Amino acid sequence: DEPTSSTGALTEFVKKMRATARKLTLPQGSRDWNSMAVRTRSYMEDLHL
Amino acid sequence: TFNDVKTSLGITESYDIVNAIRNSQGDNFKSYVPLATANNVAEVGAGILINQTVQNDFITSLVDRIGLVVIRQVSLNNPLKKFKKGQIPLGRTIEEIYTDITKEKQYDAEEAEQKVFEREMPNVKTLFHERNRQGFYHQTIQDDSLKTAFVSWGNFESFVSSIINAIYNSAEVDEYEYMKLLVDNYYSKGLFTTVKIDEPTSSTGALTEFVKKMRATARKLTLPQGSRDWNSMAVRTRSYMEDLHLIIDADLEAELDVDVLAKAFNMNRTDFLGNVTVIDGFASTGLEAVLVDKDWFMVYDNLHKMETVRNPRGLYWNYYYHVWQTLSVSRFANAVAFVSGDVPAVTQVIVSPNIAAVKQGGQQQFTAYVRATNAKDHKVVWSVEGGSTGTAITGDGLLSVSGNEDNQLTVKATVDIGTEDKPKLVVGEAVVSIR
Amino acid sequence: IIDADLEAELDVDVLAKAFNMNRTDFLGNVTVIDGFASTGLEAVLVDKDW
Amino acid sequence: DEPTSSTGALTEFVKKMRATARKLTLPQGSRDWNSMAVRTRSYMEDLHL
């Protein structure tokens, strides 16, 4: 919702972002979040924002 | 072996960045104007899919080569592995025995006079499990034809090993998936005690209500006096807080952290009780969360073998990784579902002494536990079938078997749902052997 | 003596979001139970001699 | 002067102040922070307010 517009948008940003970050590191892997639609998995220390 | 190899094969542009830069009016693309090879960088910024042969810019007839090959490897692992109970090397069926508690009797020495040796069996319930998964993974490696795609053994070899690694990853992924299947399965059969919840996420009020219901439930599950209300077997039992596992998912824990834990100061008063292990959600409609005992997961290994065979004629290897295992659920373990949306008025009628052996002409008491999802009253209609004249249930669970009975009996506990205009119902059931 | 459900209401909504929990806690002792039969009964406060 | 509507108008200057201060310390060192329009770079310990 574009943070700089209304407070709370930041909190929604944070939610979405943190949730996504979690998803990106789930042990079993996932086939989302990449342009090759391949199943993969990352690590938080290997993940940059 | 392809023609018309456009560089943007799978591209769905949102905008033409080249023209965006080209037409910068002092807007935010102006910082790329100082760049010189930006257009070329952009052209293949995301890499390419179909390799197109590229000739050397100086010689032209001389062709440019692949200078580096990077083989990437991912390790996938089953989160739920921690719930694996063990390994069964032989034999098939697994049996659980749960000795339940009993009904006290009113004191009366006048009856005791004659009933000293009256005997009474313990309320013991049992549950069986069978080996279920027996799948395998199949990969083919044409390791002679593959030689043409490499120029070194390091690359060739590591590639091959990657394929095998993929087999193991496959196993981990699917094992995980099967365990989720058990949850959705058990749910689909109406075997969880359903906590109806307002849909979480949609509001912080809903989220909060969810949390309250969660902690309250977790509390109930561990109370000393025990409870029958969390078991499909309706046995009274007790869980330990450290043995409770709440699954939920990443979406939910994010909201918990952001809306609740950052804004609270006394975190422990809102934290989820027991252990929490997020996953990728559940597929059952509305199944938002599952709270179960660590011993709910009846999971045992039965077989893990990789065998191979080469096809002379075809010059290739087949890899067969067999994975057998017992995947089940203990109905003696406490199990709770948090379900959004609408649920049935009653999800399950549990009739007790499932297996009886009434002496012909005798009788048997059947209790019943109606898993209501609400505070409404639900009268139970008892019914007996498969028997003959004089065999009937009086209601309130008392089965009266006729002296001439000889057929296996079915005892039912019907709970009506809705109006008589195509009324619905749930049937609990127990069976009786006639001695 | 309190139904776990009510206990949680306090816990989550009130004890959290407070700097001085001692101004919101329940007076007397608290014994959490599975609940009570009879519509509307949430918690019971009694003297030890009850 | 104008933070924008939606709460905000209590930290609007705080955010701009801190943001700007960070911009002057970006490693790549931008222009637009000095009257000579030169690429340059400041350090937090060298900034004064």
From Swiss-Prot, chain B:
* Cellular component terms (Gene Ontology): T=3 icosahedral viral capsid; viral procapsid
Subcellular location, record wording: Virion
Cite the entry's keywords alphabetically: Capsid protein, Coiled coil, Late protein, T=3 icosahedral capsid protein, Virion
Asked whether the keyword Magnesium is assigned, the reply is no
Domain BIG2 intervals? 345-424
Q: Which family does it belong to?
A: Belongs to the phi29likevirus major capsid protein family.
Query: What is the protein named?
Result: Major capsid protein
Coiled-coil spans are 104-124
Q: Which InterPro entries match?
A: Big_2
The answer to whether the entry has keyword Coiled coil is yes
Which organism is this protein's natural source?
Bacillus phage phi29
Q: What does the UniProt record say this protein does? A: Assembles to form a prolate capsid shell of about 54 nm in length and 45 nm in width, with a T=3, Q=5 symmetry.
Q: Which residues cross the membrane?
A: none
Domain of life according to the entry? Viruses
Q: How does it assemble?
A: Homohexamer. Homopentamer. The prolate capsid is composed of pentamers and hexamers of the capsid protein.
